[model samples]
Target chain A: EIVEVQGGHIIRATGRKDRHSKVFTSKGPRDRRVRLSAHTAIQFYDVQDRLGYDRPSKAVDWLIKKAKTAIDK
Target chain B: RHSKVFTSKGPRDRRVRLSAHTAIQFYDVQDRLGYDRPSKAVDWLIKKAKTAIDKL
Candidate 1:
């Protein structure tokens, strides 16, 4: 598989190159975060909505707080 | 070994939500990225999440 660079991560196509929409995290490299395709991200959100765990503002706020805390740390 | 639809953990990690919004937003800097900005979707989701958060 090829490591198609995007954003902060290198993703591996779980299917074909054209099918990178199925991208998933693969083990490799430090400082390289991983991600799924936009489609996959939407699927994840569907899952999130189904699970009743969606706390957008809270999660966003949580992310901000975590980032600040980390910076302070 | 698996994941259920919803979780108390706030969606399926949001790794890609972060990435999708990043790409769309950065690419849209010129207003040339078209109207397909996923960040808009992210904003909608954040609003939904905010509503959900407020209820609890």
Candidate 2:
């Protein structure tokens, strides 16, 4: 099962046949952090809602495609 | 010899969900990198992508 720790700030899988049960800290690599404005965050969620995506990272895949399209235009 | 109804941890195993479209690529990477879980696969992918982006 997945356990939420630190008041939902972190999530980790517990007890599994594979490495899937590894623990993950909430914060990612500092150098990888990408700051987003509230406006852009809402825009991504709006797209996620419209597309029925379950996660923001999935929505980001769509956003990546769209961003490339914008550049191609 | 196994029982008629062998039970497994099955769906109860901890999971990280991915959209079907994303899963296509995710699965490939999972196999390629020998990551047993989507959680690790995604973590590796995101970190690699970010590092590459920073170089550009």
Candidate 3:
């Protein structure tokens, strides 16, 4: 399933059981999407691999940051 | 050697050649992004590159 966020961005569930997602940004012509497993997306934005608190909102924020970087470039 | 070759298996199962220098960059980015594999970094980079030319 797919969801639209701010500025035509999208968050899509790539796997239901494992619960991974693909965050698509509207900054690019084709809407660049990044594959992010739930942990990778919502949990760990920093520190080492495979560790963090699962905060979905912050994950969305991260997506927006990436999109802004692309747009600014 | 100082260089490394990363292999990705999928529809085409292609391989990539990277210098140790470039490999470190990919590894650092991949680690920071929490990707499961180096291939995902390559995939992301490829997607970024593809999008860069979408207007052409």
> Which candidate tops DockQ?
1
Writing each residue's lDDT as its tens digit, candidate 3 over B1-56 gives 32222212111112323322233334445555666664465445434443332332
Candidate 3 regions exceeding 4 Å error are: A1-73, B1-13
Best by TM-score: 2
- Between candidates 1 and 3, the one scoring higher on TM-score is 3
Q: Compared with the true structure, what per-residue lDDT tens digits does model 1 show for residues B1-56?
A: 22223333444543433333233222232133232443443343344344343443
Higher-DockQ candidate of 1 and 2? 1
Candidate RMSDs in order = 13.0, 17.4, 15.2
Is model 3 an incorrect, acceptable, medium or high docking prediction? incorrect
Cα lDDT, model 1, residue A53: 46
Q: In lDDT terms, how accurate is model 2?
A: 0.39
Q: In terms of lDDT, which candidate is strongest?
A: 2
> Which residue pairs collide, candidate 1?
A51-B6, A56-B49
Which digits, one per residue and each the tens of the lDDT, describe model 3 over residues A1-73?
5565443333454555854334432222121223343333222233111223243223233333344444243
Minimal lDDT window, size 10, model 2 chain A = A26-35
User: Which CAPRI tier for candidate 1?
Assistant: incorrect
Give the alpha carbon lDDT tens digit for every residue of B1-56 in model 2. Answer: 21111112111112224433444434445456665444454444444444333332
